[PDB]
DNA sequence: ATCGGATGTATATATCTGACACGTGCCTGGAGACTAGGGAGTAATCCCCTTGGCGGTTAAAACGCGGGGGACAGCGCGTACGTGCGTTTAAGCGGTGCTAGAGCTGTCTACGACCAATTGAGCGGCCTCGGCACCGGGATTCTCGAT
DNA sequence: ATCGAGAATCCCGGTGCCGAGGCCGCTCAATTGGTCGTAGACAGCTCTAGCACCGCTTAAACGCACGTACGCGCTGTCCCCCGCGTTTTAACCGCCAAGGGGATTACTCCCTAGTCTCCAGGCACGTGTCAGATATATACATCCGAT
């Protein structure tokens, strides 16, 4: 199901994600499509950082929504 | 003075001196009140009252009465010249007005 | 009442056009509670640090500005470690026409350059004014040790 | 229990007597309306301040002290009612 | 009940001192009380202001004397100033 | 045949009589009703001490008497004997009550 | 020549304009919106940040706040919207 | 042959010009000498500050301008266009200055 | 010693003041009355100013004294302190 | 409101709250002065000052000038029906008068 | 040097720099405005003092100043001043 | 210039009543003695500014003359207002009943005054550059004698 | 109804100057923190007088008719401010020079607020009686029509 995700660089991309997918499933799909490592990645929506321990079904996210991605530079 | 009699009697002042001092102290006028101010103020008040009462008594006597009434007070205040200027804004209750008719309105010969 | 419709429009227009470098959304199920995440500007010593802001909305909007507070300690002449804010647009220059997007972008702009005209905390502003390098180093290590 | 057109209670003979006390010999026919308007304006001015004075003190009945204080504020001192 | 103060006895004493036979009614008595209070407030307020102007903090006799000079018209001012001077001279010794 | 005065002299007699008395010329109850109406127009559910009503009536009577004195002065200045509303307006404007 | 309902809504209330008032800066606002701004806001135009206290005082005594043209236009174009409120 | 204005058409020009400016009208040294002469009666060998004299001049000018406005109104009320001493006296009496 | 100074208030000065007031025709007897009322007003203000100066044990009529005398008389003035 | 900011900025004024409080306390007005009185008084004073200044600046712009002069103050005060009533018995030095000419004196 | 004499010059200037960002004010107008502020302040404070005294009190709270403002100013000005002051005090208290 | 009605006003006498002048109990505010400290009087010094004077130049005041516009006096008109009388209306007075609200008293709790350390807001002094005063030439617009 | 000449007023451009706005050093007043005595907010009780109603006078208001005298418009006369040109006077600006007294500082002393104790001066309440208001009946001043 199409979903928008936008990084800190201002680029927004579309990914197919069913509501039953976990956050780690979305991270694995992100690895499949670009491969940016998930450890530096954090997902933000509704002022809350997404947790891999909760499926997107209970997160109550509708269609065509936009998520935020923040990169955590390991080092510096 | 001899510092023997009451302050009102000490200065020969009929108006009270202690009450004036208390009013000056607790009237929010100044941080301090001098020891000579209340005597002066009470003297001024008594003199003014004496003048007004003398004029009112004369006016009542000329009217064949022995009881001062507000009409006599208004006559005494208005007929004088200094007291008219001092009290030119006040309104005496039941005081009436002075009797005057403009010279023009009087009948022709 | 009307504030409900205003908040609905605000969430809708934040959702359709998300701001760049700032992400805001309601943590609580109620609409009044809100959270914002801000990432430091490129030309700043705040690289590698993300800051979280808690927002409480008054019963009446937009006539009364919403309260905001820093969750994490920030080293900046404008921003104390306690979390108070010294900003004119939030309270003195607040008007109904302002939106949450405008105030958040104003805060983001403030993060780039310190303002010593009205220093809430005097010693940190004085240290920054004395030399830029020491302030840059302390800000970098502070945002590295706390934010991450 | 509201009231209406009470300004007409200031009857023409009353204004005539007031003028005669003032010292007036001949009165035109249009004086009465102007005098009623003037009196109404003056009453409004005094009553507004009197009601404000009695409202500040958290009371419900306007008293003589309030009226005399309003009159003194407007510059028309009144004697014979206390204060 | 409560006790309210007034200048009744003093004004009556002055009246008997100036006219041993005439009497005064109640309305004239209230009028005299109001007049005394009004003049007192005027003089005291003017003296307080005048004392404040010169960066002083006390109301001596000369402040009241100058306030009397300012307020009352000419002849009354001169007579009242003379009377007050005599009263204070008698009091101080 | 019946004896009637020439128009004008009994006005002078009324002037002489009414300048000596000191009663209240306006009636009591109409004035009380008017002041109550104005007060209730200002703040509802108000009560009046009788002394307040008497003081208000005295003040209004004194003010009107003074205004009529000045109005007559203006009318005599204009070489007339009949006071007219323009004279009241001029007196009020000079006094500064309405400008 | 005729504005639509899309441009007819309040810029601060996002509802159909009810009893519009025109500011000196040629800005239109709904009457309850204006009252709330004057009671609680900083007594300035939300869009232009210019004081309207002088104009407000001048127009309050004569009850000149209302704008007849825009109010008539809105009440005739969308009577249902005005009536439902 | 010489061009002469109609009588009364340049007085309006003077009114228009003087109501437009703010400068002082009375001369300065005559006013200062008059003030010193008036003051030396109350107390001898007094001294004055220039600011005090300027303030006195401003106050007197404003008072006279207001009195002349009132006099003009009183004169026009009597169907005239010329001010006369009786107009000034009537205006002062109505204002109550000389009682 | 000074004397005969009310003549310093010339006819043109009174005409200019009246023109500011907004009058068109000025009679020939206005000037004397104007000089009289001006003299009365100056006396009234100067008395209070000099008394204020005397109380403060000073010897110069400061602008402040004139300002407070005018305020006492009911014609308060702006632009000289206060 | 939050503490740790100057009193004048706590309620967002410009006039000094502290100076007004000191003037009320040491001015021989009452034995005790409340803590909310000076703020309210400063608010009223600042509002009146801004109200005067707005009209003064409008008049100055009308006169093709950019520096406010006493004539502008007199024009602004006299042209407002409510400020004129408030400042009825005051004289503004170097102010002049409003321009008016009685309709009778105008030429035919 | 001289003594430190106080005034409202900087405060009036700051207020002026809000309504008109690009309009200066002369010195004479500054003195006139200073005198006006002093006059209004003294009027309001004196009326409040008398009003508090009439009720046998000892404190000049905000209510006395509010009623003094209501009495002294005309209608619309009184309403606007009361609104401004109430807003300022309720902002200050919280 | 009066003279006689006819009216209203001023004067003398009985009377009776409610407000005024006085007496009494008492309690709260005024008087007396003592102490501490800050406000004010007094002396000395500095320098700001107030008075006084001299010389030039020129805007302003003083004077005189022609005359046209306005102030003032007299006449005539009719319309509004004064004066008296009969009639309708509500103020004024008395008596009663009720309760909302003014006024007084007891608790105590939170607001405000006092005091010490201190640091930044705001005041005194300097300096500079731009808005405004001013001069010179020109375009625009009321004004009046003549049609 | 208008045309045109002479004069006052407004616009525009260039030049110069002084004072308004901004900056810096600094000294003192506002800030902050803590403590303590009391002002008034509140709950409760009393009891005063303000509100409402009802019935009976008769005093005041109301409508009407008749007459008359005063406002207002009009016309005529004369005289006095006004506009303008010429001459005389001192206002005004700049300059110099002295010293008078206003403003500030340091020191000392004595006047007053604060505290406690004690007592009598005046305040609320009650009471007797006479000053003045009211009713009744004469004496006289004044107005008006007409000789
Ligand atoms: Zn709205
Ligand atoms: Zn706008």
* DSSP of C22-84: EEEE-SSSSSS-EEEEEE--SSSTTTT-EEEEEEE--SSTTTSPPEEEESS----SSS-SS--
Q: Give the DSSP letter of residue J32.
A: E
* Nearest Cβ partner for J30 among B28, B30, B31: B28
Residue C93 · residue C111 · CB < 8 Å: no
Domain presence at residue K31: yes
| Closest listed residue to residue C70, CA positions, set C47, C59, C86 | C86
Q: Which residue in J has a C-alpha nearest to residue F96's C-alpha?
A: J88
Please state, in angstroms and rounded to a whole number, the distance separating the CA atoms of residues K73 and K81.
Answer: 9
Q: Who's near B18: CB < 8 A, 6+ residues apart? A: B7, B8, B38
CA distances from J50 to J15, J44, J90 (A): 11, 10, 19
**Which ligand is in closest contact with the Cα of G47?**
2
For residue C70, the cross-strand partners are: C53
Angle at CA of residue B63, ends B59 and B66, nearest 5°:
85
In strand M, which positions have an atom below 7 A from any protein CB? 6-9, 19-21, 28-33, 39-40, 49-52, 60-62, 67-72, 80-85, 90-92, 101-104, 111-113, 121-125, 131-132, 143-145
Please state, in angstroms and rounded to a whole number, the distance separating the CA atoms of residues C24 and C43.
Answer: 23
From the list C50, C86, C90, C98, the catalytic residue is: C86
Give the tokens for residue E25: 């009614």
Residue D82 · residue E37 · CB < 8 Å: no
- For residue A6, the surrounding DSSP H or E stretch is strand A2-6
Please state, in angstroms and rounded to a whole number, the distance separating the CA atoms of residues F55 and D68.
Answer: 7
Tell me the technique behind this structure.
Answer: cryo-EM
Neighbours of B10 (CB within 10 A): 16
Q: Which string of DSSP letters, residue by residue, matches K7-48?
A: -SHHHHHHHHHHH-TT-EE-HHHHHHHHHHHHHHHHHHHHHH
Spacing of C-alpha G67 from chain mean position: 8
Residue A4 phi, psi (nearest 5): -95, 135
Architecture of domain A2-71: Roll (3.10)
Number of H helices, E strands in chain E: 4, 2
Torsion of CA C83, C89, C90, C95, to 10 degrees: 180
**Tally of domains within chain F:** 1
Please state, in angstroms and rounded to a whole number, the distance separating the CA atoms of residues J44 and J17.
Answer: 12
Give the CA I77 to C1' M33 distance in Å.
Answer: 45
- Give SS3 for J91: strand
What's the sign of the alpha-carbon dihedral B33, B38, B39, B41? positive
Q: Who's near B74: CB < 8 A, 6+ residues apart? A: B92, B95, B96, B97
Torsion of CA D54, D58, D63, D64, to 10 degrees: -60
Residue C92 contacts J where some CB pair is shorter than 8 Å: yes
Please state, in angstroms and rounded to a whole number, the distance separating the CA atoms of residues C127 and C139.
Answer: 12
**Which ligand is in closest contact with the Cα of G33?**
1
CB-CB neighbors (< 8 A) of D67 in chain B: none
Give the tokens for residue C59: 């019963």
Give the CA E1 to C1' M126 distance in Å.
Answer: 17
Domain presence at residue F59: yes
Spacing of C-alpha F31 from chain mean position: 13
Residue C50 phi, psi (nearest 5): -115, 140
CB-CB neighbors (< 8 A) of F59 in chain D: 46, 67, 71, 76, 78
- For residue F88, the surrounding DSSP H or E stretch is helix F85-95
Residue span of the structural domain in which E79 resides: 25-92
Exposure class string for C12-32: b at 16+ Cβ within 10 A, else e? eebeeebbbbbbbbbeeeeee
Neighbours of J75 (CB within 10 A): 22
Query: How many Å is the Cα radius of gyration of chain I?
Result: 16
Strand boundaries in chain G, DSSP class E: 20-22, 28-30
Q: Which residue has the tokens 């106080």?
A: K6
| Closest listed residue to residue I30, CA positions, set I13, I45, I43 | I13
Torsion of CA C54, C59, C62, C66, to 10 degrees: -20
Biggest alpha carbon distance in chain D?
48
CA distances from F83 to C99, I7, J52 (A): 67, 41, 42
CB-CB neighbors (< 8 A) of F99 in chain J: 84, 88
Give the tokens for residue F27: 């009636």
| Closest listed residue to residue F51, CA positions, set E56, D50, I54, E54 | D50
Residues of chain G immediately before an interruption (C to N > 2.5 Å): none
| Closest listed residue to residue C72, CA positions, set C111, C37, C44, C102 | C37
Residue E24 · residue D69 · CB < 8 Å: no
Angle at CA of residue C87, ends C86 and C92, nearest 5°:
115
Please state, in angstroms and rounded to a whole number, the distance separating the CA atoms of residues F92 and E81.
Answer: 39
Please state, in angstroms and rounded to a whole number, the distance separating the CA atoms of residues A58 and C29.
Answer: 13
Give the tokens for residue H94: 């109505």
Report the separation in Å between the CA atom of C5 and the middle of ligand 1, taken as the mean of its atom positions: 12
Residue A52 · residue A24 · CB < 8 Å: yes
- Give SS3 for G6: coil
**Which ligand is in closest contact with the Cα of C6?**
1
Please state, in angstroms and rounded to a whole number, the distance separating the CA atoms of residues C143 and J58.
Answer: 50
Burial class for K81, CB neighbours closer than 10 Å (0-12, 13-18, 19+): buried
- Give SS3 for H57: helix
Neighbours of B84 (CB within 10 A): 14
Residue B37 · residue E60 · CB < 8 Å: yes
Full set of structural domains in chain G with CATH: 20-84 (3.30.40.10)
For chain C, list the contacting chains (3+ Cβ pairs, <8 Å): A, G, J
Please state, in angstroms and rounded to a whole number, the distance separating the CA atoms of residues J8 and J21.
Answer: 11
Neighbours of D46 (CB within 10 A): 23
Please state, in angstroms and rounded to a whole number, the distance separating the CA atoms of residues B49 and F94.
Answer: 35
Query: What residue ranges do the domains of chain J occupy?
Result: 7-86
Q: Who's near H50: CB < 8 A, 6+ residues apart? A: none
Residue H78 · residue F79 · CB < 8 Å: yes
Give the tokens for residue C20: 């760049």
Peptide bond into C62 cis (omega under 30): yes
Please state, in angstroms and rounded to a whole number, the distance separating the CA atoms of residues E70 and J2.
Answer: 51
Please state, in angstroms and rounded to a whole number, the distance separating the CA atoms of residues B57 and B65.
Answer: 9
Residue K8 · residue K34 · CB < 8 Å: yes
Give the tokens for residue E23: 């009497």
Count how many residues are written for chain I. Answer: 82
Please state, in angstroms and rounded to a whole number, the distance separating the CA atoms of residues F68 and A12.
Answer: 87
What's the sign of the alpha-carbon dihedral A19, A21, A25, A31? negative
Full set of structural domains in chain D with CATH: 8-74 (1.10.20.10)
| Closest listed residue to residue B104, CA positions, set F76, F65, F18, F69 | F76
Please state, in angstroms and rounded to a whole number, the distance separating the CA atoms of residues H41 and I44.
Answer: 12
Q: Which residue has the tokens 């203000």?
A: I45
| Closest listed residue to residue C103, CA positions, set C41, C49, C51, C36 | C36
- Strands J32-33, K59-60: pairing kind: parallel
Count how many residues are written for chain E. Answer: 93
Sequence-ordered alpha helix ranges (H) in chain D: 12-22, 31-56, 64-74
Q: Who's near C130: CB < 8 A, 6+ residues apart? A: none
Number of H helices, E strands in chain A: 1, 5
- Looking up residue H22, the CATH number of its domain turns out to be 1.10.20.10
| Closest listed residue to residue C53, CA positions, set C90, C104, C6, C101 | C104
Give the tokens for residue C92: 């003195």
Please state, in angstroms and rounded to a whole number, the distance separating the CA atoms of residues H63 and G44.
Answer: 40
**What is the domain class of J7-86 according to CATH?**
mainly alpha
Q: Who's near C111: CB < 8 A, 6+ residues apart? A: C38, C40, C41, C44, C46, C76
State this model's resolution in angstroms. Answer: 3.9
* Nearest Cβ partner for F20 among B94, B99, B107: B99
Please state, in angstroms and rounded to a whole number, the distance separating the CA atoms of residues K65 and J37.
Answer: 7
Number of H helices, E strands in chain F: 4, 2
CA distances from J89 to B104, I72, I74, J21, K30 (A): 35, 12, 7, 28, 20
Residue K36 · residue I78 · CB < 8 Å: yes
Please state, in angstroms and rounded to a whole number, the distance separating the CA atoms of residues D48 and D50.
Answer: 6
CA distances from E5 to D82, G23, I40, K49 (A): 12, 59, 43, 22
Report the separation in Å between the CA atom of G54 and the middle of ligand 2, taken as the mean of its atom positions: 15
CB-CB neighbors (< 8 A) of I56 in chain E: 53-54
CA distances from A8 to C38, C82, C96, C146, H7 (A): 10, 28, 30, 20, 87
- Give SS3 for J102: coil
Domain presence at residue F1: no
Please state, in angstroms and rounded to a whole number, the distance separating the CA atoms of residues D46 and D71.
Answer: 7
Give the tokens for residue G50: 């210019």
- For residue H56, the surrounding DSSP H or E stretch is helix H50-77
Give the tokens for residue H20: 């437009």
Exposure class string for B87-104: b at 16+ Cβ within 10 A, else e? beebbbbbbbbeeeeeee
Query: What residue ranges do the domains of chain A occupy?
Result: 2-71
Residue J63 · residue J86 · CB < 8 Å: no
- Smallest CA–CA distance, residue I47 to chain H, in Å, is 7
- For residue H47, the surrounding DSSP H or E stretch is strand H47-48
Domain presence at residue K41: yes
Judged by CB atoms closer than 8 Å, whether chains meet at H94 and F86 is answered as no
Report the separation in Å between the CA atom of I49 and the middle of ligand 2, taken as the mean of its atom positions: 52
C86 is catalytic: yes
Q: Which candidate in B24, B28, B32 is best for mutational testing of the J interface (most J CBs within 10 A)? A: B28
For residue E58, the cross-strand partners are: B32
The count of CB pairs under 8 A between chains B and E is 168
Spacing of C-alpha F99 from chain mean position: 21
What's the sign of the alpha-carbon dihedral E13, E15, E21, E23? negative
Residue I41 · residue H60 · CB < 8 Å: yes
Residue F57 · residue D64 · CB < 8 Å: no
Q: Give the DSSP letter of residue J2.
A: -
Q: Give the DSSP letter of residue G9.
A: B
Sequence-ordered alpha helix ranges (H) in F22-84: 28-42, 50-77
Angle at CA of residue G49, ends G46 and G53, nearest 5°:
90
Residue H56 · residue I66 · CB < 8 Å: yes
C2-146 falls under which CATH superfamily?
A: Ubiquitin Conjugating Enzyme (3.10.110.10)
Please state, in angstroms and rounded to a whole number, the distance separating the CA atoms of residues F14 and F31.
Answer: 23
Q: Give the DSSP letter of residue I58.
A: -
| Closest listed residue to residue J98, CA positions, set J81, J106, J107 | J81
| First vs last C-alpha separation in chain E | 42
Residue C35 · residue C91 · CB < 8 Å: no
Number of H helices, E strands in chain B: 5, 3
Residue G44 · residue G52 · CB < 8 Å: yes
Burial class for H65, CB neighbours closer than 10 Å (0-12, 13-18, 19+): buried
Please state, in angstroms and rounded to a whole number, the distance separating the CA atoms of residues F78 and F88.
Answer: 13
Half-sphere exposure of residue J6: CA atoms within 13 angstroms, side-chain side:
14
Residue E12 · residue E24 · CB < 8 Å: yes
B32 CB-to-strand L distance under 7 Å: yes
- For residue C111, the surrounding DSSP H or E stretch is helix C100-112
Residue span of the structural domain in which F30 resides: 9-95
Q: Which residue in A has a C-alpha nearest to residue C46's C-alpha?
A: A76
- Looking up residue K62, the CATH number of its domain turns out to be 1.10.20.10
Burial class for E2, CB neighbours closer than 10 Å (0-12, 13-18, 19+): exposed
């Amino acid at each position: 199901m199409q979903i928008f995700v936008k990084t800190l660089t201002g680029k927004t991309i579309t990914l197919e994600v069913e509501p039953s997918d976990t956050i780690e499933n979305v991270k694995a799909k992100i690895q499949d499509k670009e491969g940016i490592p998930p450890d530096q990645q954090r997902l933000i929506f509704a002022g809350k950082q997404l947790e891999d321990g909760r499926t997107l079904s209970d997160y109550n996210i509708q269609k065509e929504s936009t998520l935020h991605l923040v990169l955590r530079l390991r080092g510096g | 003075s001899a510092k023997a009699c009451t302050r009102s009697s000490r200065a020969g002042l009929q108006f009270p001196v202690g009450r004036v001092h208390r009013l000056l102290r607790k009237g929010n006028y100044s941080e301090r009140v001098g020891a000579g101010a209340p005597v002066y103020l009470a003297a001024v008040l008594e003199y003014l009252t004496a003048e007004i009462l003398e004029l009112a008594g004369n006016a009542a006597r000329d009217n064949k009465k022995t009881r001062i009434i507000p009409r006599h007070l208004q006559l005494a205040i208005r007929n004088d010249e200094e007291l008219n200027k001092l009290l030119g804004r006040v309104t005496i209750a039941q005081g009436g007005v002075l009797p005057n008719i403009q010279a023009v309105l009087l009948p022709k010969k | 009442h009307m504030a409900l419709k205003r908040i609905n429009k605000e969430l809708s227009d934040l959702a359709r056009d998300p701001p760049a470098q700032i992400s805001a959304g309601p943590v609580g199920d109620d609409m009044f509670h809100w959270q914002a995440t801000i990432m430091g500007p490129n030309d700043s010593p705040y690289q590698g640090g993300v800051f979280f802001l808690t927002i409480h909305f008054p019963t009446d909007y937009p006539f009364k500005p919403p309260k905001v507070a820093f969750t994490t300690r920030i080293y900046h002449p404008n921003i104390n470690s306690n979390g108070s804010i010294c900003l004119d647009i939030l309270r003195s220059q607040w008007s109904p026409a302002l939106t949450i997007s405008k105030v958040l972008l104003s805060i983001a702009s403030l993060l780039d350059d310190p303002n010593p005209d009205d220093p809430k905390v005097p010693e940190i502003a004085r240290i920054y004014k004395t030399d830029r390098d020491k302030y840059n180093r302390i800000s970098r290590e502070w945002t590295q040790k706390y934010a991450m | 229990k509201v009231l209406r057109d009470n300004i007409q209670g200031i009857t023409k003979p009353a204004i005539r007597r007031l003028a005669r006390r003032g010292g007036v010999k001949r009165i035109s026919g249009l004086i009465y309306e102007e005098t009623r308007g003037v009196l109404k304006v003056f009453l409004e001015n005094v009553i507004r301040d009197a009601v404000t004075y009695t409202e500040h003190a958290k009371r419900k009945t306007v008293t003589a002290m309030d009226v005399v204080y309003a009159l003194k504020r407007q510059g028309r001192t009144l004697y014979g009612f206390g204060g | 009940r409560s006790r309210k103060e007034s200048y009744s006895i003093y004004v009556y004493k002055v009246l008997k001192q100036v006219h041993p036979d005439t009497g005064i009614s109640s309305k004239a008595m209230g009028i005299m009380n109001s007049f005394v209070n009004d003049i007192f407030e005027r003089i005291a307020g003017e003296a307080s202001r005048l004392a404040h102007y010169n960066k002083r903090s006390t109301i001596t006799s000369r402040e009241i004397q100058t306030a009397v000079r300012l307020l009352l018209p000419g002849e009354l001012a001169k007579h009242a100033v003379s009377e007050g001077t005599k009263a204070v001279t008698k009091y101080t010794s | 045949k019946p004896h009637r005065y020439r128009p004008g002299t009994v006005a002078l007699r009324e002037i002489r009589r009414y300048q000596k008395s000191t009663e209240l010329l306006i009636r009591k109850l109409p004035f009380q009703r008017l002041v109550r109406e104005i007060a209730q127009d200002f703040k509802t559910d108000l009560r009046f001490q009788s002394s307040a009503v008497m003081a208000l009536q005295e003040a209004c009577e004194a003010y009107l008497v003074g205004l009529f004195e000045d109005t007559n002065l203006c009318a005599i200045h204009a070489k007339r004997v009949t006071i007219m509303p323009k004279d009241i307006q001029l007196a009020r404007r000079i006094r500064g009550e309405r400008a | 020549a005729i504005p639509s309902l899309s441009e007819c809504q309040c810029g601060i209330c996002m509802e159909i304009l009810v009893e519009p008032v025109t500011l000196p800066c040629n800005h239109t606002l709904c009457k309850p919106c204006f009252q709330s701004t004057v009671e609680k806001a900083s007594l300035c135009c939300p869009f232009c940040r210019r004081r309207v206290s002088s104009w407000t005082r001048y127009h309050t005594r004569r009850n000149s706040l209302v704008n007849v043209e825009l109010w008539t236009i809105i009440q005739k174009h969308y009577p249902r919207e005005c009536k439902l409120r």
